[PDB]
Amino acid sequence: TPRLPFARANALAIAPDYEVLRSRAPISRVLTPAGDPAWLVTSYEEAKEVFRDKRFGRSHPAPEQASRISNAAIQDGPSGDFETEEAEHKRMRRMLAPAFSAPRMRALGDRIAELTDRCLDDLQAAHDANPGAPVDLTDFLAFPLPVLVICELLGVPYADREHFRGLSERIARMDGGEDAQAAMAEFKAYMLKLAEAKRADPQPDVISDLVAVQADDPTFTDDDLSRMATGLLFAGHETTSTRIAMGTLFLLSDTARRDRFAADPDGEVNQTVEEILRLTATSGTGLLRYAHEDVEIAGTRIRRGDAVLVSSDAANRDASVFADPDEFDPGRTPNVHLAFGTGAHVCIGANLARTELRTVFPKLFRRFPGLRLAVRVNRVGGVDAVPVTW
Template sequence: MSVAAERLQLPLPRPSVLDLAPLYEVLRREAPITPVTTPAGDPAWLVTRFAEVRDLLGDKRLGRSHPEPEQASRVTTAAILDGPTGNYATEEADHTRMRRLLTPAFSAKRMRMLSDYMQELVDGYLDRLIAEHETAPDGVVDLHAGLAYPLPVAVICRLLGVPEDDQELFHSLSERMADLTIGAEAHRARDEFNRYMAGLIEAKRPQLGEDVISDLVRAQSADETFDYDEMIRLCVGLLFAGHETTVNRIGLGTLFLLTREDQWATLCAAPDARVDAAVEEIMRLGAPGDLGLLRYAHTDIEAAEVTIQRGDAVILSVNAANRDTSVYSDAETFDPDRPERTHLGFGHGAHFCIGASLARTELRVVFATLARRLPGLRLGKPVDELEVRTTLTGGVTALPVTW
């Protein structure tokens, strides 16, 4: 099997929510940087091999902004990962300021302080699911609606200072922004989300609290180079990413574990000792979206025998890189005991996910608690019968389980 000469059309069809398209293996071997056509119909480069994805993630010659935004390739019709973001002239300085402001709030120490709160939440959600299970006619309950969704929402609301009562509103806006099928409606949802966040900020301004949004409002008031609209976009991005990605990781992690009885039994036998390794393997193998991280070349770049020209769109497939057989033994196998401990699930370099400690802590609490309290947990429906979300971040719409 060889890669065709013409541009591939993204997304590549995948056989299930847990597997990637087999073509990725061919691309990594034969064309690790290959020209593709995006879902929006524009040209881009797709990067699939671990070495190139890692190196380009850390390459300052790539950015999220574009030297001529109106000429940039569009990737999707959603309002997330659709095209360039930020100011080309100030992107690096803006990013440095953002990291400086947010690093203390998302530090590993801060996340450990939140872990007791997370544990209380998880135990409460499981109490309700257990009660629901006892009265359900078929004994099947939805772990997505009962745990995977509400936990990350509650935690990010506490951290950012967002009223939890608003969760249905911002969840609906998040779903619409990331929807790949509704076109202009996705961008209207982003505008609504921006207006919601601006209203929340102005309501908080007279009495700022000890939360991330209050910290950003203080910083923006004190720094004339910190644009108000930039602050709004940053707050929306934190609220979106802070719950959406973890919701999907909980769902995918549950599917990986429950479709591998030996791995689930091993975790249940020693939850506290085994959970860290399970979480890292979930982050490696879990692939909630079908595209990758979007960057634009700020200058010509030579890599893997191709020339990426200034302004070209580059899609870095972390999903494909994390299954690279030249890096991982039995790369497609879910194996928390694998000797290779590194992965790109949180990115790499200057843009390494600032919420990595938050996500890791939530996942550890969730899977250790499930293993302790519900060792008989099993799926209530085959994986191939689960409905996959039509959003940029993918995942499943429901996760029926029983025990």
């Protein structure tokens, strides 16, 4: 039985195991990092189907009987009450709608531009301080930028950015240790201090939105509020960071690609970002669902209670949908992909993520015309270094 995570030989490639499994069945039995059996979906059509099929949810009817995936913060095992999941999910999407609305995204887009400029300043200063040496674009740009965007999204006071990033770094390990466990308490406590700050002076940010939800709905507790804020950090930081890093690696690993983008960044950026999203593959597992009844799909009998891991990474390389699927081709004319999922759980931050990526790459290649480059994905798995010079 195949055992996740699958191995690969270089950062830009996808693990070869997925195509081996896909060629035999769209849905295959695998073992998770936690050692339990799950179905892995590797084809585009079946992944799309599971994403859109309400018979698969995040909850499990009898969670004690369920396969575990890992010990990660999210996408790790059963989540939420089975009887109430759809209602709770609808309530979550509604409460976060203001935060991702167009006026809020207009403001955040301006802050993203400014934050990008400041990160590129740090990259240039590191290069000037160590002339002749590569500098790590991940350290100065890919890793910090999306967590600073999360600060602006949540409403973290400017003076606290370092404090916040320190707490997040300690909970981001997901290692179950004693430090990480006390860091989660300190982090949730910090979320609750900020909630009181927003009650004093409401702002156009997520924490203010969530205290407004509480004043109209006493069932939404401080723990619910701090859990939601914590979950946006997990969902929105390293995901985005790895696409900045890996997208830079795609563009720099073939000079012709770099030069095409650099020659017309404003014209090329939308389609370039979509191809980065299609090809970047960093998952150790997949997007987690449990069957809420027996479901037959593509000749596989998925029984009630079974774990299903949807591999968007693998779905996005299905050769029946994307010809030459391992080739980086920003001109792919239909380039709908499942990097953000689809259906009811489609990434609520997709537009924010696209705004981050679409802002960074034109600024990066305008600022640094000479820019050039100098084995398994972890559930927790950090962002690869991208050493560059110019």
